[PDB]
Amino acid sequence: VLADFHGEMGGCDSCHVSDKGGVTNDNLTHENGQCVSCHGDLKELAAAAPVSPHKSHLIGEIACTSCHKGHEKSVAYCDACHSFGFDMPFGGKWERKFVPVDADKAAQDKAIAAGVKETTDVVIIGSGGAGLAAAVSARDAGAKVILLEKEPIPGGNTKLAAGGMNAAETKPQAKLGIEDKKQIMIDDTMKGGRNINDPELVKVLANNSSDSIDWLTSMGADMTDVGRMGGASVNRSHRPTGGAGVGAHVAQVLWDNAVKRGTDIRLNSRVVRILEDGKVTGVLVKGEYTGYYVIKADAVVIAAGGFAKNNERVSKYDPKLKGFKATNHPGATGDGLDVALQAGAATRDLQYIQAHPTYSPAGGVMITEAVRGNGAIVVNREGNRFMNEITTRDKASAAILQQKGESAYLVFDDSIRKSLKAIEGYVHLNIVKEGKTIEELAKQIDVPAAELAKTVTAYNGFVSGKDAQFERPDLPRELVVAPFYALEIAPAVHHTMGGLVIDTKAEVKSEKTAKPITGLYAAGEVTGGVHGANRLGGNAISDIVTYGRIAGASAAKFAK
Ligand SMILES: Cc1cc2nc3c(=O)[nH]c(=O)nc-3n(C[C@H](O)[C@@H](O)[C@@H](O)COP(=O)(O)OP(=O)(O)OC[C@H]3O[C@@H](n4cnc5c(N)ncnc54)[C@H](O)[C@@H]3O)c2cc1C
Ligand code: HEC
Ligand code: HEC
Ligand code: HEC
Ligand code: HEC
Numbered sequence: 187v188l189a190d191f192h193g194e195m196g197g198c199d200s201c202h203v204s205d206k207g208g209v210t211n212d213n214l215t216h217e218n219g220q221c222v223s224c225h226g227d228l229k230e231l232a233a234a235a236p237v238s239p240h241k242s243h244l245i246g247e248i249a250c251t252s253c254h255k256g257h258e259k260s261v262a263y264c265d266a267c268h269s270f271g272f273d274m275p276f277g278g279k280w281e282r283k284f285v286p287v288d289a290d291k292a293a294q295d296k297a298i299a300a301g302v303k304e305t306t307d308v309v310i311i312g313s314g315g316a317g318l319a320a321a322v323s324a325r326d327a328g329a330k331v332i333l334l335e336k337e338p339i340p341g342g343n344t345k346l347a348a349g350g351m352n353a354a355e356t357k358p359q360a361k362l363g364i365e366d367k368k369q370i371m372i373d374d375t376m377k378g379g380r381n382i383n384d385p386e387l388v389k390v391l392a393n394n395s396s397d398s399i400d401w402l403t404s405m406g407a408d409m410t411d412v413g414r415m416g417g418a419s420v421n422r423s424h425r426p427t428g429g430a431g432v433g434a435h436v437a438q439v440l441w442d443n444a445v446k447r448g449t450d451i452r453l454n455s456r457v458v459r460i461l462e463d464g465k466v467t468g469v470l471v472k473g474e475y476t477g478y479y480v481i482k483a484d485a486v487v488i489a490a491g492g493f494a495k496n497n498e499r500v501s502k503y504d505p506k507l508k509g510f511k512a513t514n515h516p517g518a519t520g521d522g523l524d525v526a527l528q529a530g531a532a533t534r535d536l537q538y539i540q541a542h543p544t545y546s547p548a549g550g551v552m553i554t555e556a557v558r559g560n561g562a563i564v565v566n567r568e569g570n571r572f573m574n575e576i577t578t579r580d581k582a583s584a585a586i587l588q589q590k591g592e593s594a595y596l597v598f599d600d601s602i603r604k605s606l607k608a609i610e611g612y613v614h615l616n617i618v619k620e621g622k623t624i625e626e627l628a629k630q631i632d633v634p635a636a637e638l639a640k641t642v643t644a645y646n647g648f649v650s651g652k653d654a655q656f657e658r659p660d661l662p663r664e665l666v667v668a669p670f671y672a673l674e675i676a677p678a679v680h681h682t683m684g685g686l687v688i689d690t691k692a693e694v695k696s697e698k699t700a701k702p703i704t705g706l707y708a709a710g711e712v713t714g715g716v717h718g719a720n721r722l723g724g725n726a727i728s729d730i731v732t733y734g735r736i737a738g739a740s741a742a743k744f745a746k
């Protein structure tokens with residue numbers, strides 16, 4: 187392992203700040219400074235490469251030490267989701283065992299009384315889009331902030347985002363000739379959420395849309411290419427130009443701005459208990475290398491995101507998903523909720539767990555909803571259609587579940603390819619089957635040529651505005667310019683629509699007292715009610731930004 191290979195050289199000193207050893211802080215700045223001092227930084231390393239582990243889509247600072255582990259085997263962090271078989275010096279397999287947020291209670295108790303280390307105004311749990319947005323906002327005229335993230339690298343699931351941030355009206359929308367209006371936001375959002383959605387939440391989720399999409403814009407963002415997500419009417423999923431992805435893009439831009447203002451962002455730092463006056467007094471942090479510690483603060487924003495990814499827990503409410511795969515990063519296991527619950531928060535819609543119908547087994551990645559939206563059709567093992575490809579996720583997950591072998595085949599054109607640039611990434615991942623003709627495509631895929639061809643020729647007829655098979659309301663492109671591609675895909679646990687109960691100010695309500703627990707804030711996937719029973723594609727990112735901002739600001743006035 188790497189620190190022995192380097193003990194052989196110069197000592198403990200090489201990396202650590204002292205000759206006895208040990209880490210100063212959990213972001214591991216010193217040591218990573220040491221790394222780069224002898225080896226160069228990531229751009230330097232990246233330039234040297236001929237798929238390289240030193241240059242990727244991850245956002246934010248990506249410590250050397252997030253892969254190159256000192257005192258233990260090392261693993262590319264890319265293996266949490268891909269299987270690149272890189273040949274990592276001092277290699278190891280990626281393994282994560284979920285450990286309870288409450289275990290080691292004695293230890294936590296012993297350490298709560300044992301001093302009082304730092305104090306700040308506002309603490310924010312998690313670094314995805316909601317926590318960063320909150321960072322900007324608390325910081326941005328108001329308070330001192332100290333955001334913790336448990337992962338070794340930032341941006342949660344936010345950074346994987348693919349297809350768009352919903353907003354209504356007055357976003358750039360103007361400039362493309364997309365005619366849309368606020369109530370249509372609300373109204374689809376209720377319809378997709380099967381009408382249980384907290385009405386006041388879906389309201390500000392409608393009415394702050396444009397501003398969050400302008401805020402992003404005041405910060406550096408590129409929200410201009412618009413498309414169609416399953417479930418809405420007027421086109422409104424904002425993204426970067428030509429079909430790239432908004433998650434990385436948004437995460438990055440709010441990472442920068444949060445860092446730019448004075449946020450004190452700390453990785454390998456998991457919050458394991460909110461501190462009880464019953465007012466929120468502070469937080470108990472388990473810094474991975476520096477041990478436990480208390481931070482006193484006046485407001486706590488909870489922005490830890492969802493629990494998709496914990497199959498134990500998700501199987502708990504919907505055992506249909508036991509054994510299913512997830513589209514999330516490793517961090518979404520519910521720590522947040524647990525922390526909050528211990529604090530006596532109220533939750534809702536915990537059992538409504540959204541599976542994404544088009545994940546790819548082979549690639550270990552989601553494959554965006556926009557591929558079907560720009561024109562792809564889905565095809566079972568027999569070579570035929572079985573569904574209106576732009577239906578709701580739950581219906582589309584259901585239908586592929588009910589098909590030969592539990593999986594199905596996205597099938598598109600050279601025309602759909604060109605038109606949605608996320609598709610170059612899939613191509614880059616070796617997961618896309620190619621055919622110079624549909625008969626060629628079939629052979630790769632192991633689906634019958636005359637049936638697939640008849641399917642595709644017929645689909646084309648439907649394309650002529652009428653799907654006399656499955657009702658697909660939009661038929662964007664014809665599927666007739668070669669080469670032709672396909673991917674097999676299947677449903678994967680993806681979003682948890684439920685969560686902590688909060689108002690339009692982002693306050694968290696107590697189960698017992700049905701009022702807010704004081705100075706306890708929340709925003710993002712960790713919260714409940716914004717999406718009802720079903721989340722619309724494109725509503726997560728807009729919920730996260732607009733609610734973060736509110737959570738931040740609310741927490742800032744508190745303490746002020
Ligand atoms: C593959 C994929 C594609 C999606 N694409 C889209 C899209 O195109 N459009 C859209 O609207 N939505 C999309 N979604 C929905 C969007 O991703 C939200 O679901 C996600 O943004 C949630 O934001 P967040 O701020 O709440 O959390 P996250 O981005 O997950 O941020 C999470 C932080 O909390 C850290 N954390 C958790 N617990 C603790 C703790 N106890 N202490 C410290 N840190 C902690 C976590 O590990 C995590 O990093 C997508 C999600 C995925 C996974
Ligand atoms: C001389 C033999 C060394 C002593 C004593 C210690 N180290 Fe290290 N170290 C390095 C990293 C990247 C870390 C972070 C965690 C990890 O990646 O393993 C650490 C951490 C420690 C710790 C904490 C133990 C724990 O894992 O919880 C101790 C006690 C420690 N270090 C003491 C990096 C390096 C390194 C660079 C390659 C060298 C030469 C050493 N460490 C050597 C020593
Ligand atoms: C910070 C914690 C790090 C990390 C992540 C790495 N180094 Fe070093 N390194 C140095 C020298 C002179 C060598 C040897 C070259 C050789 O023997 O051919 C290395 C080796 C490595 C590797 C190489 C694995 C391989 O053999 O391919 C890796 C992955 C690596 N390091 C990472 C020099 C230095 C330092 C100068 C004092 C410092 C500081 C570090 N390394 C710290 C780090
Ligand atoms: C995970 C995403 C990584 C991060 C972040 C960093 N490194 Fe890396 N490193 C990683 C792998 C999987 C490999 C080897 C496999 C391959 O195909 O490249 C490496 C290799 C190195 C090396 C040896 C190669 C070289 O050009 O010398 C060194 C010296 C190295 N890595 C150092 C290093 C530093 C300083 C980093 C911070 C900027 C860093 N790595 C980031 C995985 C990952
Ligand atoms: C899980 C959270 C991931 C980790 C960690 C890494 N990647 Fe990833 N990667 C992930 C997804 C969900 C996607 C697809 C996004 C989409 O647009 O639908 C990707 C994409 C890639 C690609 C192809 C697209 C591109 O932008 O090049 C490559 C080549 C890739 N990822 C490589 C890669 C590397 C090298 C990573 C380590 C630094 C890495 N990924 C981390 C999911 C996740």
Ligand SMILES: O=C(O)/C=C/C(=O)O
Nearest residue numbers: 348349554555723724
């Ligand atoms: O781009 C997609 O298909 C997913 C969107 C979401 O989860 O909101």
